[model samples]
Target: HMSINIRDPLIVSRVVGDVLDPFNRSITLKVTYGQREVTNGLDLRPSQVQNKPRVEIGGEDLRNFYTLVMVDPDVPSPSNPHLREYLHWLVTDIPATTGTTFGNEIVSYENPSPTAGIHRVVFILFRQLGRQTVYAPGWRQNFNTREFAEIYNLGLPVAAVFYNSQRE
Candidate 1:
């Protein structure tokens, strides 16, 4: 049996190449806020995302250590995006199915407060080469996922989802 991507939502949104490379989504990740799960192209108001979101991951491998990251590609608001890849949240060494608490929290979760225009906040997961192989960046601004992947040898995102944060 074979599974192929036909809808290709990431390509249409330009997120596949814009913030992340083209790769097969081979895992399951759940990102939720306020007891409501995010739907693709869903609109999440900044006021609503008042606290850190709930993230869950699942996999079959015993060596199921994973890394999760949150970013705003449209940094400093979509209108003035001079700097990109603004890091929002990062957690490494999270195991499968249980213990997000057992994981390491590198960066605290920051809620999105977009200004002027629509801003896309994306969260993606990378499969680590080994446990504890990743580290925190010095600065949150200009955090490059592509470069981060190459340096740490964390492969492309296995799952990703984004929401458009509003400002008014």
Candidate 2:
């Protein structure tokens, strides 16, 4: 049971504030664009990130299900976060070891479209209590991760990671 660094940079960048709390139960979440694994806090140019990256979630319990959510906190611009959480994608009922393909795409994957400064694309993984239900928001902005987790009883996130991206 390894613990993720959950503080520092995440707090500094406000992902912690907008997403889940710090946790120790770590799960392998690999987000890749073609052949490249998205490194924590790494910079990715917009052109290089047009498509949704393949996300692989690793866990020992094959019976356990999970949910995947990707959001851009800097929707329009970082300075003025009008659309604080522009949901890029959302998938539910993902089984262990499987990626987005196995889950129900409540919201289809959308590429990061940061218009201004560099943006943070945060990927959050939640372990579902069982087969769960999720609905798509009417729009992408003002989406609340905490509220959604509470509604579905997803609990604290088991795994989370993010990367930086900006228009090229």
Candidate 3:
């Protein structure tokens, strides 16, 4: 079975902030931080060794990616109580330079990765035609399915991905 792990020294933010979008409009998103510490002791936090706040990965580069998603495989799926495949976060069209940094330094409202171990949490960016805003969108009921169906349609970006369970 697949599992999810969020690294320590990293926190997802919930306060009001700005993330770039394909429409060139910095969209305001409502997000909740992840729990402290990555599952299975994987170190998903930031590195001064890298000297960057966030890691970018996928396809598009020298430009912004279009979608972002953070998933918690541990969450109990509603369809099956015994089986779990719940999602932690599934935000789309996050800015290229707008990734999060795990705690190289302590900050407010910190929620690190999970504790189970190494697994892949994807941040997908899509390139769409129009400006998507929290205002006046359609089909608010089943966005996940919609997103899944339309994920490939969102566009592409330059991607940089890094995974580490232990410090080098």
| Top-scoring candidate (lDDT) | 2
Error of 1 at 89 (Å): 0.2
Candidate 2 lDDT score at position 15:
76
Count steric clashes of candidate 1: 0
Q: Which stretches of candidate 3 lie over 4 Å from their true place?
A: 1-42, 45-65, 74-112, 133-168
Residue-by-residue lDDT tens digits, candidate 2, 1-168: 434464567667777776667665568889998788876688888787788888899975999889998988887888888888889899999999998889899998788878798889999999888876666678888888888888888888887788898877
Global lDDT scores for all candidate models = 0.82, 0.83, 0.29
Under the 3 Å rule for N, CA and C atoms, how many clashes does model 3 have? 38
lDDT of 3 by residue, 1-168 (tens): 222122211122100011112222133222222333223224454222222133333233435434443332232322232222223333444444444331111111212243443333322234433334212123222224233425445432222122232122
Backbone clashes (count) for model 2: 0
Which of the two, 1 or 3, has more lDDT?
Answer: 1
Per-candidate count of clashing residue pairs (backbone under 3 Å): 0, 0, 38
Q: Measured by TM-score, how close is model 3 to the native structure?
A: 0.33
Backbone clashes in model 2, listed as residue pairs: none
Q: Which candidate, 1 or 3, has the higher TM-score?
A: 1
